[PDB]
Design a protein around this nucleic acid. Structure first.
Ligand SMILES: [Mg+2]
Ligand SMILES: [Mg+2]
Ligand SMILES: [Mg+2]
Ligand SMILES: [Mg+2]
Ligand SMILES: [Mg+2]
Ligand SMILES: [Mg+2]
Ligand SMILES: [Mg+2]
Ligand SMILES: [Mg+2]
Ligand SMILES: [Mg+2]
Ligand SMILES: [Mg+2]
Ligand SMILES: [Mg+2]
Ligand SMILES: [Mg+2]
Ligand SMILES: [Mg+2]
Ligand SMILES: [Mg+2]
Ligand SMILES: [Mg+2]
Ligand SMILES: [Mg+2]
Ligand SMILES: [Mg+2]
Ligand SMILES: [Mg+2]
Ligand SMILES: [Mg+2]
Ligand SMILES: [Mg+2]
Ligand SMILES: [Mg+2]
Ligand SMILES: [Mg+2]
Ligand SMILES: [Mg+2]
Ligand SMILES: [Mg+2]
Ligand SMILES: [Mg+2]
Ligand SMILES: [Mg+2]
Ligand SMILES: [Mg+2]
Ligand SMILES: [Mg+2]
Ligand SMILES: [Mg+2]
Ligand SMILES: [Mg+2]
Ligand SMILES: [Mg+2]
Ligand SMILES: [Mg+2]
Ligand SMILES: [Mg+2]
Ligand SMILES: [Mg+2]
Ligand SMILES: [Mg+2]
Ligand SMILES: [Mg+2]
Ligand SMILES: [Mg+2]
Ligand SMILES: [Mg+2]
Ligand SMILES: [Mg+2]
Ligand SMILES: [Mg+2]
Ligand SMILES: [Mg+2]
Ligand SMILES: [Mg+2]
Ligand SMILES: [Mg+2]
Ligand SMILES: [Mg+2]
Ligand SMILES: [Mg+2]
Ligand SMILES: [Mg+2]
Ligand SMILES: [Mg+2]
Ligand SMILES: [Mg+2]
Ligand SMILES: [Mg+2]
Ligand SMILES: [Mg+2]
Ligand SMILES: [Mg+2]
Ligand SMILES: [Zn+2]
Lengths: 75, 104, 159
RNA sequence: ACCCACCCGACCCGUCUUGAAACACGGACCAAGGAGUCUAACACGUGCGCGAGUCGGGGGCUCGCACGAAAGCCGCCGUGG
RNA sequence: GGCCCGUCUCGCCCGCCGCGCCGGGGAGGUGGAGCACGAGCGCACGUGUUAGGACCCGAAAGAUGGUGAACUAUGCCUGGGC
RNA sequence: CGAAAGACUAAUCGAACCAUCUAGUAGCUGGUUCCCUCCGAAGUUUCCCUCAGGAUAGCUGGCGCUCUCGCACACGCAGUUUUAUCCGGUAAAGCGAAUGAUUAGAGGUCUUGGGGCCGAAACGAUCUCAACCUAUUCUCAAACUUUAAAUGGGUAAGAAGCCCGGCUCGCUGGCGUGAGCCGGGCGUGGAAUGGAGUGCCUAGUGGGCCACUUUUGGUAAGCAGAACUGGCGCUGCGGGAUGA
RNA sequence: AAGCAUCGCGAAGGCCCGCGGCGGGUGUUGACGCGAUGUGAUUUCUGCCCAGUGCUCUGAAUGUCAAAGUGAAGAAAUUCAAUGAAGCGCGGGUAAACGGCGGGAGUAACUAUGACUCUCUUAAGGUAGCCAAAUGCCUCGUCAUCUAAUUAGUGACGCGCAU
RNA sequence: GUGCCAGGUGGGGAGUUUGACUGGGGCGGUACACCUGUCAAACGGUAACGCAGGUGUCCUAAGGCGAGCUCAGGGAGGACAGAAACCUCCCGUGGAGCAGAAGGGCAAAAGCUCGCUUGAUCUUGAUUUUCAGUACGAAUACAGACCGUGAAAGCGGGGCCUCACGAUCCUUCUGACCUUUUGGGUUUUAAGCAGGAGGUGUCAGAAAAGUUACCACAGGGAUAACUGGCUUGUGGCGGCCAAGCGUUCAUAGCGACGUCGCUUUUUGAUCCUUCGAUGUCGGCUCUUCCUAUCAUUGUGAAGCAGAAUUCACCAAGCGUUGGAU
RNA sequence: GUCUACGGCCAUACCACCCUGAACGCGCCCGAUCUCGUCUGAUCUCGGAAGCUAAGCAGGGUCGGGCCUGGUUAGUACUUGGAUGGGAGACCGCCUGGGAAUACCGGGUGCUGUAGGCUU
RNA sequence: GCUUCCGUAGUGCAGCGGCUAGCACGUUAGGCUCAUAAUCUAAAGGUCCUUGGUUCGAAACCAUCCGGGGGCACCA
RNA sequence: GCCCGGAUAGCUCAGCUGUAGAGCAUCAGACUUAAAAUCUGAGGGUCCAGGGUUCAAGUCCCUGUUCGGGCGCCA
RNA sequence: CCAUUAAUGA
């Protein structure tokens, strides 16, 4: 009582019926697999980004003043 | 195979590489008062023949040998099992094979 | 059935080409790689640790992790019904740079330059690509002479 | 719509099967019966009430029960899920 | 990113009715069916998976309790025949 | 119980008959009851004392959700092609290139030896073959290859992209790097066609067969087993007289 | 089936029934008896082998050997040690118990064979007889005879797959 | 002797088992868990009881560093010493060696010889490989420590890479001033957490001998024994060439070394129909058909003088016997 | 033009033979007390400078071998898709598109980075 | 068919890769004995079946072919 | 897995710390007129291998290899 | 206590 062992006959048709997809590419991909010391220290950098907010806001205000002087000299 | 009786390797309690005394691990007595042993004793007591299977399909030819690593430095006395691959010949201090010698 | 080994049928894939055996050259060791670089994979038979699997030989992915002397890469594997973006750690010597992005970057730079140019001028210049057009009808000249008459050759048995 | 005549088509239904009209199986004909139901545990979807609540199980109070062994109610309105 | 619990590593600080093999806290890995200003409960309907006789009809079997030596098998008792 | 045949034990005997457990179990056969509409398969992966069966993916149906709009004004997706960029080691071809086989001449005491002839012998003249060399020549190789296609396989063809200015780092650090946060400025990103993404349940199936091309075993087969694709199965219709 | 030959038993026994009991059959019986076997009248003969599987005999000369009991430790559960019955091992017998009865080498005035001697696995190696049988694949063996013709029949031979 | 425990014996008796794949099943093998080259059709994947094979080991170094050299082979030389003993020079892309089967890889190595060593140590995750994207085994970069080596760069958490191996439950050992031992406290003990081991070779893992011709049941033409169907290796039959046989003379009659075809009158090969049955061999009787013609009718050729006999054509009309076994 | 030290590409660079090297170099060379390791200062290490382009090395040449790149081979072999094309088959022809490799015949025989010299 | 065994003087055979292919039964001497039987030792004794291959060297190791011989082939 | 024993000359057997003995066989010698038989001599010991108390061990004990027997069975 | 045998013709 022998039988048929293995084939791939109707399989490509079955696979292309439901539309073989590219994987779900998303913006801001995950960090699973990145090396742990560099994940550790980017976590420290994201922890200490809140330090220096007054310097960042003041320098952004001076950059707005610089763009205002530039558009005043241009217009 | 051949292993020595001393091995400078890691110790869990100290946290450093110390020399350990190497010997061979053997099985102990079942002590007759374990939970599964007393469960099997009560399940075997009475009629019913035998209630649990006897394995009789042995296919291996050797065992994974286990070294019992015991620390040499006092006040620690740490022991640790270390398994090596399957071998049917095994010895300690066994004839360091003397490279550069006539084989006759 | 066959066997399920890791290097089953890699006699020509994970081998070195002719008269290119020996010491791996050192610039190949000291390529640099950043995150997001488009990278193709070609296996090398000399360096054997960190070797990718034979189903990635010739595949191209993007880099997600850069370790000390290896590179992690997100490649695309079609597992029979779907394409999976899966992450493999491949050592440096099995890795080149893919120049499929370089022509795109030079075209982006050329389009940015040709967009900054002729913006204050007011002219609209076509920036897209365009395939091979019809061959722009012309005159085929000859200097008095006639075309050479071709003749079907008579048959004669070679062997 | 009853019968007959002509032209073309037209092998006997169900099933096992890759393949049945089969020299594969069941089958004279007709009337009646005849085969996916019920309980419990779940899972998902849907309809309704209330909403960080929800449900009254079980029990008790009202009607002597035609309709009823229905319905209504509970410092038990939450013991408990 | 942040927080809770289990486990691991590096170190310090605080408190007492009993100053201890006391109790609590920090930073960073990792496991969880977690939190991150709820969504469940109750009833009814449909489908699917089960346990039950389980869509219907079907065995060769096994066990329990009884009935038969009017046929036949053999032993005994009493008669008959060649 | 048997002068022994597993014979007889009420037409029942290799364990009688009646009743009950019992509607015992069965992956095994047979059957399964109204109409219309819409959609619509698989005999394949893996595991199982699994090969007549299940589970799991795949194929399928239903229930939906999230968005876009031929109402003067489209992001994305492909059994498609092109533009660049890599991968091969198959067909072919080669072995005057390597490995293995293998044909025959020619020139050279490489170098010995055996049947040999002139010689007590001699690399002293003649040639022979086993293993020698040098350029040649003939035929090959699924488990050979310097080369090496056609058909294929991945990538990129933009807003999730460039160009600037500044903070953070406990990583690395001669200064520096690298990564992460902010703020600002620039839109038709090759051809043609598509309206897309996503979550639950979920039946049936898990015996296949045939044909162009490639190909294994076999003398061959309406034989057995494979690769791509299309059909029959599930499908009528015109033709091949009949007919998968 | 008669004949033949074994085995057990002297009654608190042998064989057996029975859920049970000072239970029951043989037994209203007593080795010329009862129970269990093999072979199958008369005549003649019944060869060799106890290695194996059985059965059976004794043995503090004894390897293994459970429960109960004995001694030692501890707070005890528990552990250890000695002792350690029957039976298995060891040693005799037993084949009218089951059964088995092959190879190798040397060796005789033609060749051939071996009257004779040694060894093996495992203990001897098929004795007296018999046969192409109801028992022999080759095979329809070879010879004689019965026939015109005989894969049949009978009588001889033995090399007998496998008496 | 009885009552209750303990040990031996026990098919007298009871229950149950006696794997799977398979060109039917048993026997023969493992294609049952793995690895290489090919099949395989230039990504991957891909089958058969397709081919050649190999494995359940081995290694205190054959693991990890650092240093110095080059291997196999050939030529030339040198007392014994020749073709192979030992010394030297030159050529020497690997034609050697790396434990094994094969493939790939490697020349101041990954080989040989030395010096030191135990990264073959402990603890979290992530990923690849068969894959369902689940395990196990193997591997890949990293992270924290502790180390070895080297002058350092660095390398190493087993073997130059591809195989050398194993769930639940139970047992054993190791570790924490770890938790519980259910009224509280101590101790023995026991149960927990984690790691390693004792193994399931039918290798994702039952504990398992046969016979049935006294057999039974549910099924299968998923699958054989008959016939029918495809093919014709084999059996039988007919040509092509022509070295020779024939006193000379290939072809009157034959015909080697080769090669092309027919038949289902033999056996093979397959499993397409039939297992809710198609009565399974011979002999007797009886009818019809084919020609690949033994004889008869008509002919041609002979190594046809006559007789007798061979080759060939038209041709199945009519015949093809009686018996011993 | 050129060399040294470290190189990238890794024969257009290698291999065999011949010729030429002024200067700075690079080496050959002279010894073994110190550091160092061998049977041997041959190698390695150390301390130097009397000679030298003899050698390495650099450049050039060979109707050189090899290597790199082209033509021929050849639109040949092969090959995607198609036909109710041929042929008993084996295979072959056409449409449609791509398209090799030998032998054979030409050209070439290393470019370049960093730092420092020489030809002042 | 499959697994095999052996091809060595006229004959039964033997042969550790390096021998002058041991040796016996025959044929032919010869010694000895009074002459004979047995001898204790010698000569004329080999198509290593055949072909091809490795090794320095082959009967010995491998591959094919050619002759004699042993055993397996089960149910319907 | 535990316990009880053995491993010797080419072959078969004894032998307890102070040159391992016998028998079968090989080659020789001896007796007898000669042969068979008998007697004697020589060769041959990895005491399965190693380690340990000891001055010396095969002998007393363990570690690896076989030949056995008796017990007991949980993955 | 053990002790077997001496080839044919002259
Ligand atoms: Mg199947
Ligand atoms: Mg009991
Ligand atoms: Mg069926
Ligand atoms: Mg169907
Ligand atoms: Mg069918
Ligand atoms: Mg039908
Ligand atoms: Mg029919
Ligand atoms: Mg049926
Ligand atoms: Mg009927
Ligand atoms: Mg009705
Ligand atoms: Mg469900
Ligand atoms: Mg709901
Ligand atoms: Mg509850
Ligand atoms: Mg029913
Ligand atoms: Mg049901
Ligand atoms: Mg029933
Ligand atoms: Mg039963
Ligand atoms: Mg019978
Ligand atoms: Mg429809
Ligand atoms: Mg089944
Ligand atoms: Mg290939
Ligand atoms: Mg080819
Ligand atoms: Mg089915
Ligand atoms: Mg079939
Ligand atoms: Mg008897
Ligand atoms: Mg007898
Ligand atoms: Mg006996
Ligand atoms: Mg006899
Ligand atoms: Mg007769
Ligand atoms: Mg007779
Ligand atoms: Mg039984
Ligand atoms: Mg049964
Ligand atoms: Mg089967
Ligand atoms: Mg392919
Ligand atoms: Mg080195
Ligand atoms: Mg580390
Ligand atoms: Mg190594
Ligand atoms: Mg019978
Ligand atoms: Mg039978
Ligand atoms: Mg069939
Ligand atoms: Mg037939
Ligand atoms: Mg034929
Ligand atoms: Mg002639
Ligand atoms: Mg009938
Ligand atoms: Mg009929
Ligand atoms: Mg005719
Ligand atoms: Mg007759
Ligand atoms: Mg010197
Ligand atoms: Mg010079
Ligand atoms: Mg010069
Ligand atoms: Mg040239
Ligand atoms: Zn320690």
């Amino acid at each position: 009582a022998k039988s048929k062992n293995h084939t791939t006959h109707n399989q490509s048709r079955k696979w292309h019926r439901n539309g073989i997809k590219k994987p779900r590419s998303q913006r801001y991909e995950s960090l699973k697999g990145v090396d742990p010391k560099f994940l550790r220290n980017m976590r420290f950098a994201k922890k200490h980004n809140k330090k220096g907010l007054k310097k960042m806001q003041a320098n952004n205000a001076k950059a707005m003043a610089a763009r205002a002087e530039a558009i005043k000299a241009l217009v | 195979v051949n292993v020595p009786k001393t091995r400078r390797t890691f110790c869990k309690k100290c946290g450093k590489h110390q020399p350990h005394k190497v010997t061979q691990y053997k099985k102990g007595k079942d002590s007759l008062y374990a939970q599964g042993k007393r469960r099997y004793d009560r399940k075997q007591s009475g009629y019913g023949g035998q209630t649990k299977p006897i394995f009789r399909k042995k296919a291996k030819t050797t065992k994974k040998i286990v070294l019992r690593l015991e620390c040499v430095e006092p006040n620690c006395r740490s022991k640790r099992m270390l398994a090596i691959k399957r071998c049917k010949h095994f010895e300690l201090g066994g004839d360091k094979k003397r490279k550069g010698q006539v084989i006759q | 059935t066959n066997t399920k080994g890791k290097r089953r049928g890699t006699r020509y894939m994970f081998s070195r080409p002719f008269r290119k055996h020996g010491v791996v050259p050192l610039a190949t060791y000291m390529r640099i790689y950043k995150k997001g670089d488009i990278v193709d994979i070609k296996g090398m038979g000399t360096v054997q640790k960190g070797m990718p699997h034979k189903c990635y030989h010739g595949k191209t992915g993007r880099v997600y992790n850069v370790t000390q002397h290896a590179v992690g890469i997100v490649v695309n594997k079609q597992v029979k019904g779907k394409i999976l973006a899966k992450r493999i750690n491949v050592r440096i010597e099995h890795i080149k740079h893919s120049k499929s992005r370089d022509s795109f970057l030079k075209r982006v730079k050329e389009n940015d330059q040709k967009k900054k140019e002729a913006k204050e001028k007011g002219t609209w210049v076509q920036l897209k690509r365009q395939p091979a057009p019809p061959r722009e009808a012309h005159f085929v000249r000859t200097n008095g002479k006639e075309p050479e008459l071709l003749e079907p050759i008579p048959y004669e048995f070679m062997a």
